[PDB]
Amino acid sequence: EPLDESSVKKMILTFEKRSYKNQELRIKFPFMESELDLNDIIQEMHVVATMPDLYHLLVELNAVQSLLGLLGHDNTDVSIAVVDLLQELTDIDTLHESEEGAEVLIDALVDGQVVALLVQNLERLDESVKEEADGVHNTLAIVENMAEFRPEMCTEGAQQGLLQWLLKRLKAKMPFDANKLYCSEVLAILLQDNDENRELLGELDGIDVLLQQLSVFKRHNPSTAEEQEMMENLFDSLCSCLMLSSNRERFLKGEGLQLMNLMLREKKISRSSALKVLDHAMIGPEGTDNCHKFVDILGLRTIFPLFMKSPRKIKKVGTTEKEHEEHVCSILASLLRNLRGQQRTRLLNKFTENDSEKVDRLMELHFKYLGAMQVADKKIEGEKHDMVRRGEIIDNDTEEEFYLRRLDAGLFVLQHICYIMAEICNANVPQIRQRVHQILNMRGSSIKIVRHIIKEYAENIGDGRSPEFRENEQKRILGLLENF
């Protein structure tokens, strides 16, 4: 026989007494059954998750509000009991089976500040024992759900000591368990599309935790396949934080530039996403300091071999050849934008050295991605003519699908390349300028195609940025076309 309203209410009530019963016990330490009465009933209570529509009963009978208080109970065997129940009750699919039922619980849970207490109970455990080890694990599972269910609770629950505890658990001197891995994805979830947490982590001196934690693989590849996932996860959190101007300086002070550069030299598995971190750190006006510091630590000597030839496939590395050339050219474009003085002069010397072999290379990359673009555009054009015959109306979806195909053919990288081409042709260095025009003439191609791309790259500059900033950049970029 299934369960109904009555079964649930008379199960909540039994719990609602047994808690109050066991609470009455200020007398110690005879109890031993009064407490273990409270366990198997919380245990028993799992079956409510099977009918999530009746979640309103846990609320209006003060069960959830009493479940919170049980987290701070002396015996930790009841804490995990509540924790496991809370996770059971909060699985993401169960939360979808109901609408007005999943809500009333979530609202109640965040109202009684569940995460704050989850951490308070969390910061008094001991993962030496499997039960408690699964305790922290099942605590993190809860957070993952409420965040996937309600991404605007991340800002809330992080400030309640979750993000602070996550950093601690990572930095904590323990071997690599699957719980350390779990904290890595939870930390990443909090930080994605969340300037508030990125600022919190930085204000909590968390950048140093990430950098130090990544520093171990500066020479030694991760043994486990799990750890590489944790490593790539930590790289995700770091890249997230670097998308906020405030964390650029913390990255500089933490010596993240020296570490990423170092990782590029060892050429371990770290090498692929380390290049990604360098791109994120030097991009935009807020990367100007790092751009200069990158040059002062001999960064040109590391980035330019990567520009001359792209790494071969190893297949244990996901990074494609195009994904690699996208970062290198992005980094180069940021340098050519932000570098002033002697650091700029050094960068420009890279384009003259060895009979301007770097320029010859830039022109090589240009024709490759131009062709790939030209091929993709003739294909889109053709599909459109097909759509006319078949009476298919081209709409917003068709155009969004057409655009993604342009991006995957290398639109952004070709723009960067042309920007670089323009920026170096403006440096009053006849050797570079003449070399560029000379190659275009031989290869039959034209300057006006490059001019085209620069204009389009200009008019779509700066997203999520000030309209005033957006106009100045456009003015700046377009100003490269004269004297080109």
Short mmCIF file of C-alpha atoms in Angstrom, two decimals, residues 73 103 139 144 152 167 189 217 224 258-259 281 298 311 320 327 354 384 392 443 470 475-476 484:
data_model
loop_
_atom_site.label_atom_id
_atom_site.label_comp_id
_atom_site.label_asym_id
_atom_site.label_seq_id
_atom_site.Cartn_x
_atom_site.Cartn_y
_atom_site.Cartn_z
CA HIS A 73 23.08 18.38 17.48
CA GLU A 103 9.08 25.60 -4.06
CA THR A 139 26.38 17.99 2.07
CA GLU A 144 24.85 21.43 -6.16
CA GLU A 152 20.58 32.97 -7.51
CA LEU A 167 38.89 27.14 -0.11
CA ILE A 189 29.41 26.51 -9.93
CA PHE A 217 51.28 20.15 -11.54
CA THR A 224 44.56 9.81 -11.36
CA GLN A 258 55.39 33.31 -13.36
CA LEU A 259 53.53 30.06 -12.69
CA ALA A 281 44.82 37.71 -17.43
CA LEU A 298 60.70 36.87 -20.47
CA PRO A 311 51.58 21.53 -30.61
CA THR A 320 42.53 21.44 -30.76
CA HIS A 327 44.70 31.98 -27.46
CA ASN A 354 65.14 36.36 -38.28
CA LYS A 384 20.20 29.77 -48.35
CA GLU A 392 11.91 27.63 -46.12
CA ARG A 443 49.47 35.73 -52.87
CA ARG A 470 32.70 51.02 -26.70
CA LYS A 475 37.60 55.06 -32.75
CA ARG A 476 41.01 53.64 -31.82
CA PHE A 484 48.21 51.16 -42.95
#
